[PDB]
Design a protein around this ligand. Structure first.
Ligand code: NA
Ligand code: NA
Length: 327
DNA sequence: CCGACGGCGCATCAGC
DNA sequence: GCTGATGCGTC
DNA sequence: GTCGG
């Protein structure tokens, strides 16, 4: 649907979602607003009344009333008021800094820290993640053209194979689904020497090499199975610098790899559909495994998986290439 | 009326 | 020192 | 906030 259909309503619900998460710290209300915003955004008609919207799953009484108020007034009293509120708007804004959640933002604003400038003034109150988040505030909210993603993939796959040619690396996310742009880079990593029933430096070596060639610039978090950090494409000739990008690298066991690849390829909506249909045919699919729901409903042992298709096979659904996985 | 609503790696806090 | 809780970013 | 036991 075109945005002009019910965009005013969806923007309304999304804004309400953020204040619930960031200010009220009610994560389930946040998701409730987003869900209602999702089903409305995919609704192929211009909504005439809240009663019309209430027919949709995820839209209840309270949102039906807010829609009626929005249709009749072009705005929401509560949303208008919370927008002016100095404390609430400052708290909501600070959570756009990676590393600052609702709890940290609350603390900062409690002691008078409301803006990026105040944050910059009080560096010694920020942790390592929050400093990196503050440093790349602008960059992190920029999106990544597929062209740059493909260049980022070139570097990753090359350095990874350079460290050990036996690595298997797969760039997932919306990129793998063929999206024209992405929000970050998600790299999934496995090795023949790493299984469920089994060296604690496999991830380190990959990160280190990507650091050595100055692709990875900063570290948000790093352990033995997961890396979260920053990366930057090299600049050419005399041209302007590229933005710094968010990049995640996960080390997954070989027997859990393709469940991981499918899972982190997404999308959200596709994965639920696939999960929901997995349920109706007697299987359960998580990030790690596919498991057969038993007589009583007790998941037996994880089944052998050699590819994404192996999983599709089990649940009797026909394989679908990543470009057709938005739902 | 009332509970579910995603579960987890990592960094860091609360506390022994 | 340590264990556990909490916060954070996430399919 | 919405859904459903
Ligand atoms: Na409904
Ligand atoms: Na944040």
């Amino acid at each position: 649907p075109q945005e002009t259909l019910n965009g005013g309503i969806t923007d309304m619900l999304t804004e309400l979602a953020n204040f619930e998460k960031n200010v009220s710290q009610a994560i389930h209300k946040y998701n409730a607003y987003r869900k209602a915003a999702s089903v409305i955004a995919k609704y192929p008609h211009k909504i005439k009344s809240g009663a019309e919207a209430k027919k949709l799953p995820g839209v209840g009484t309270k949102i039906a009333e807010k829609i009626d108020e929005f249709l009749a007034t072009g705005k929401l009293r509560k949303l208008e008021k919370i927008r002016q509120d100095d404390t609430s708007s400052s708290i909501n804004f600070l959570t756009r800094v990676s590393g600052i959640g609702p709890s940290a933002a609350r603390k900062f604003v409690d002691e008078g820290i409301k803006t990026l400038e105040d944050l910059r003034k009080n560096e010694d109150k920020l942790n390592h993640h929050q400093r990196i988040g503050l440093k790349y505030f602008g960059d992190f909210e920029k999106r990544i053209p597929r062209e740059e993603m493909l260049q980022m993939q070139d570097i990753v796959l090359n350095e990874v194979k350079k460290v050990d040619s036996e690595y298997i690396a797969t760039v997932c996310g919306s990129f793998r689904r063929g999206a024209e742009s992405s929000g970050d880079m998600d790299v999934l990593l496995t090795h023949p020497s790493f299984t469920s029933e089994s060296q604690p430096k496999l991830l380190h070596q990959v990160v280190e090499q990507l650091q050595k060639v100055h692709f990875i610039t900063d570290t948000l978090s790093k352990g033995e199975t997961k890396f979260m950090g920053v990366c930057q494409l090299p600049s050419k000739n005399d041209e302007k610098e590229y933005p710094h990008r968010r990049i995640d690298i996960r080390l997954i066991p070989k027997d859990q790899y393709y469940c991981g690849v499918l899972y982190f390829t997404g999308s959200d909506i596709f994965n639920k559909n696939m999960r929901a249909h997995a349920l109706e045919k007697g299987f359960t699919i998580n990030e790690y495994t596919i498991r057969p729901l038993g007589v009583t409903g007790v998941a037996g042992e994880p089944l052998p998986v050699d590819s994404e298709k192996d999983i599709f096979d089990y649940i009797q659904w026909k394989y679908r290439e990543p470009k057709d996985r938005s739902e």
